[PDB]
Design a protein around this ligand. Sequence first.
Ligand SMILES: NC(=O)CC[C@H](N)C(=O)O
Ligand SMILES: NC(=O)CC[C@H](N)C(=O)O
Ligand SMILES: NC(=O)CC[C@H](N)C(=O)O
Ligand SMILES: NC(=O)CC[C@H](N)C(=O)O
Ligand SMILES: [Cl-]
Ligand SMILES: [Cl-]
Ligand SMILES: [K+]
Ligand SMILES: [K+]
Lengths: 358, 358, 379, 379
Amino acid sequence: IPRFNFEKFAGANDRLTTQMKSVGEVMAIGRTQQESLQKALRGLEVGATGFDPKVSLDDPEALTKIRRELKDAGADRIWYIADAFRAGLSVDGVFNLTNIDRWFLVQIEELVRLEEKVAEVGITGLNADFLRQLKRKGFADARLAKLAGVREAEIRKLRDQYDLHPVYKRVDTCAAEFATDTAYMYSTYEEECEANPSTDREKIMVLGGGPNRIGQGIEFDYCCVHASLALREDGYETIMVNCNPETVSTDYDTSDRLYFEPVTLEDVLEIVRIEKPKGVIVQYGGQTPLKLARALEAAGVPVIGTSPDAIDRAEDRERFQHAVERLKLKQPANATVTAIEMAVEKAKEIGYPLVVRP
Amino acid sequence: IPRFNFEKFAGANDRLTTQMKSVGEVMAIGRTQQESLQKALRGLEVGATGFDPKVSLDDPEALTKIRRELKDAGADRIWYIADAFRAGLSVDGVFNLTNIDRWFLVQIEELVRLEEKVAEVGITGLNADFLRQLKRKGFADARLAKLAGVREAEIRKLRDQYDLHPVYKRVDTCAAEFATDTAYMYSTYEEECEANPSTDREKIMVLGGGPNRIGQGIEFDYCCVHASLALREDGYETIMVNCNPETVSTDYDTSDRLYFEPVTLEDVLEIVRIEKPKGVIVQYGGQTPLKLARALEAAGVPVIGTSPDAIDRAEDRERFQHAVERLKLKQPANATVTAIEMAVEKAKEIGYPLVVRP
Amino acid sequence: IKSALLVLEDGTQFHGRAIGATGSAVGEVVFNTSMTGYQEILTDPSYSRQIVTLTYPHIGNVGTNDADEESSQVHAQGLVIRDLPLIASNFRNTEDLSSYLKRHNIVAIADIDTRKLTRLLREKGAQNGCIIAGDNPDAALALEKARAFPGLNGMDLAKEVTTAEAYSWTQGSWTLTGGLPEAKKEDELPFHVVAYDFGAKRNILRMLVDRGCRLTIVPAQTSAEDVLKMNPDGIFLSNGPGDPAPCDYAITAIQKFLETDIPVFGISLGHQLLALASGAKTVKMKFGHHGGNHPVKDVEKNVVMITAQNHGFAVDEATLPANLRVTHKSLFDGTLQGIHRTDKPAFSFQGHPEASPGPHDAAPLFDHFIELIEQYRKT
Amino acid sequence: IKSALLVLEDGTQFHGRAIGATGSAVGEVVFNTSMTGYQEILTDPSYSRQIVTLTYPHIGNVGTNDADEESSQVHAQGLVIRDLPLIASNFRNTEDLSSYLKRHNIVAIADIDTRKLTRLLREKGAQNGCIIAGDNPDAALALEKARAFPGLNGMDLAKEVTTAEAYSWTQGSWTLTGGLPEAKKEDELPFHVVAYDFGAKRNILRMLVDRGCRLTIVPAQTSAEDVLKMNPDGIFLSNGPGDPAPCDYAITAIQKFLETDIPVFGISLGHQLLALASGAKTVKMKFGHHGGNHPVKDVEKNVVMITAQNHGFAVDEATLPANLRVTHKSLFDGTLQGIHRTDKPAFSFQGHPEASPGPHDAAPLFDHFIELIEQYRKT
Ligand SMILES: NC(=O)CC[C@H](N)C(=O)O
Ligand SMILES: NC(=O)CC[C@H](N)C(=O)O
Ligand SMILES: NC(=O)CC[C@H](N)C(=O)O
Ligand SMILES: NC(=O)CC[C@H](N)C(=O)O
Ligand SMILES: [Cl-]
Ligand SMILES: [Cl-]
Ligand SMILES: [K+]
Ligand SMILES: [K+]
């Protein structure tokens, strides 16, 4: 799936054409198209957990928007398609609008339908048999959560209960016709696990940033690789976790073990589960891993280097000002305004010109 | 199908609810639902020839209006339902909005799809087989004409060439389990004809007005009945043509032979074709039969009483002004304006107050 | 395109579409006027060797379901309809009509002028016919098959559909809310009825169970002696296909029962069978009675009932023994509809008190039969 | 919920969903790596008595059509896949895969860990197995049937798939534009080739005609003499099921043909027969070669081809008589892939030059056969 950055180009024409406008891309591996597709959506780093809705069901104008989005594709088109199904448009109609092959559309329609069931039955209806069905379709915890009106963790616990966990298969170029010594894997909800973690070495986990976007480039990926190269050289068993197809980080040669997965809490936790690393580095992949640090640590992940809290200390505008204060350092005059008129007053205080951060 | 008159009540809420707002109704009989429904539509006296579109296919805003019309029913909903299928809405989609049984919905959609084929193959693709299938589905020549992009007479020409005509079945209360001596019939595209017109008498046909509307009520029906009763008493074989279920005219006792049919040129020519009446009265059922007079006469129908042309003479503003003139009678000052400023000037001429007739 | 063809003995042809299994079907052709209940009708063993034409154009509107099966299979030889709906639309449906037919291997044809066919059968009387469904339907072959059909007159079909071995029946009627009940326990049924299976409809059995009878379904050929040995509270003669006439075994046995004081009640074929054993004669009707809107007068009370009819033969009222009193007549044609032995606890109805499908107006027929039973146990 | 289950000899189970016919299937379980060409594979006679497991998860994406049929029917004992797609989306599709399977009455299951099975077969070797599709698949029973299976080793399958009588083939290959061409008049085709149907794939025949050959398909057990009477331009030995070793009739025949000057060409099974006839030995592979990505080297030219493969037995390179030169070899495992008689106009290939499905990379092998014929006729 291509990654775009249209919000950074307000004046720009955001429709898709023959001239590229995407800034990056993500990749996913699935035992099925549905699984593969949903995995990619959740690894896209756009705040999606899968087929999250774009327009409301009670919106009178909704079919108009959806139609436009479908006829003249934008980067959101994939979401608008599921929305088309929810709103009662038919596979054929969507096809006439998008020209996307029905083979694909029907699968999305299925997903929307299951989605509907979930919603209806709530968490209660999430029996092991069903949940497992949903998992095999690529559904993310966080997605089911939303539907069922629960915390993503609730779904996760639920899985732990049913002992519902994915399995890892490997890439080998030959559909298993031949044995591999390489450790290039992807998660799926199947039977046999091919992970076979070593009990041997001390393992160090490196979390990549996913698809590149403006502000989150190769620079972070450069870092991640270097972590791998270094520690491995040092003798650690290095485990890379990334889903960016373009980079050196997703080259099987770069690490001992490579997990080509969505850099999400869910997916990572699953790997940690069986891997049980010595440490996990989340400070090199940019914003993606960073935003995960807190949750990971809480879930019991052995986060090495600068603590998540420490990180938060810096990042938090307030936690920071405090520290700056403490160190008796120079900071530009700031103020946290809630109302307009508040600002204008507070502004008069601080002094123009001003830097307005949301 | 109920008949409404919202156009006459500008400020009125035109949404259908528990309080009746209809001013009349039409009825139709067919060997199938599709046939039955389509016949009713073209006999509704609203200018419909079947499922005529209400919104254009290239209107980006179409789905929004369509959605509204389905969710909150007005008098036009039946037509919006086909437009929905035309626009890519599924049967389920339409069901969720209208709550009209799928059993009916799937039947409308089928008609649409067939309409799509006709549009596609044009009059050339209208072979005898396909055209028969169409007629069996209740399609009016007028509707087929429009899709094919030809005049209605062209479709009718075609039928005469294929010898594609309807047969008449009789109503008998008992699914043909017993014989009947009554002649209460309806057209359908089947095999056996039960018309069995007499060769015996001099026939007089009387055309009703279809469903009643404001300005076209019972008064006209009353006139229609009287004609039948009178000429029948005088010794003629009286034929009544109408499809208003509420009336005495569609009472099998009122005439020797009753054809409960749409009072259209198509429907009426077919009956004349086999009845070969002596005379046809078009002057007693109001606007409906009056508007047919010319076409009927030209198709070779023995219209009796005041001629089509004479009527025309009187209805036509121009021809009339001319007669009045000729007779040296008094008529209010009049003008035929085309533009605004033109009328201001002409108004000046004529004098205020003014009566502006579209 | 899926062709199908229906040809009558007289040469009349009807060209349509195949909606069921591929092949050929031959039998006597009939028309039923029931606007509802097609599944029940198709699963009526009484229709064995008959080709069923439905006068109501749209057949399959509600699809099908188990509870609507009047027997373990589709007995009709073929189905002839005007229109097969695009979809089944009913909460009760479990499989669409066409699918169901294919499942039961039934040759069926749609899209033909069933009204023309009906009017023909009415005017000219029953006729054997053959439906052929396949790639290229051979009209001359169909006409051959139809003309060769031996015909229903004098054909015993009851022995053809009956059960091989006797068995018990203790299951009651269906309910909207609960569906089809669990079979009762033997100790939960006061009476024990022995019912002759001449191709009995499930509803008859269920209804009897509804009234407190536990049943013992016996093969058509079962001797009176064997029955009598079971100590029946009552003896019931089920409905079924063909001519009642040639069913010697039944008549014989019935006569035996008629020597006793055991209450006997029969429905349709059973009515016929009863009348035969009583020395009355049975005739083959021109076209029969097939529908659910047939008025029957109870001549005693002078009340009318709307009934479900499904019969091609009738009891000649003009040959009725003095020991056989008339109890009901058709208001449609004046034909015999009910009789009671003036000297014995035995009575019968030409119609289907059990309906399914059809009006419930005649069910009280059952109550009388209970009466007799109660009284008989008194003694 | 329509269960289906697959049990292997070793007792390894696979729970799935039924996508084909109801019932059970038994045979040798194999895995094929083709990501396209499912229909063609299924209708490959060489798969008789074999249960086919496809590595590519989505099987049926393009539905089915007649033109992709390699024989008159589906020869594979059963079908094991990861996912059956909701729909078929191909302009060439005439019938969905599930329907198709049902039509051909094939027991097939989906939704199983096809990867786990593959690794098993690759690691442990082929295994007989059984599929059971039904209301409540019996594991034990499936295991029983599974273990009971006789085993392909030593099993002559060629005699089971061959044609009853002999016949003429004059049809060429498909074209996107033209589809399947009408059959060529006999006077059109330059050479006459006699081909032994050991369960010959249509494409081979078609590709021969394509090269100017009129064909006479002859029953497997056909005698050399009978053949030589036809005065063949060349003799062709098709592909086919089971062990080539038990095929006594053919071997003998071929040997006869080998005294002559007639050019001889065999493919796959035919290649094994030609090698036995020459004095070599065959062997049953651990799991064999089933896929369309197999690299084979023309050792003479030192070039590689991506070839279609379907074979579980092989010609042991080590037992090769000297009159038998090595032409090709597998780049995957080093196994024998082609030979040429040093003394006769006789050669064979282990892979499928006719492909279908798979790379056309090996087509030129045919050309050589032609060369032999053209030269023969020169004499
Ligand atoms: N997953 C693994 O550790 C692979 C083990 C072994 N080499 C195989 O190919 O099966
Ligand atoms: N249409 C008719 O004239 C029918 C005449 C005849 N009585 C019948 O009912 O068949
Ligand atoms: N419906 C029945 O039980 C039997 C009717 C009888 N077979 C007849 O055709 O007259
Ligand atoms: N495909 C063929 O022609 C050869 C197959 C052969 N029966 C084998 O398993 O080796
Ligand atoms: Cl017909
Ligand atoms: Cl499995
Ligand atoms: K027809
Ligand atoms: K499974």
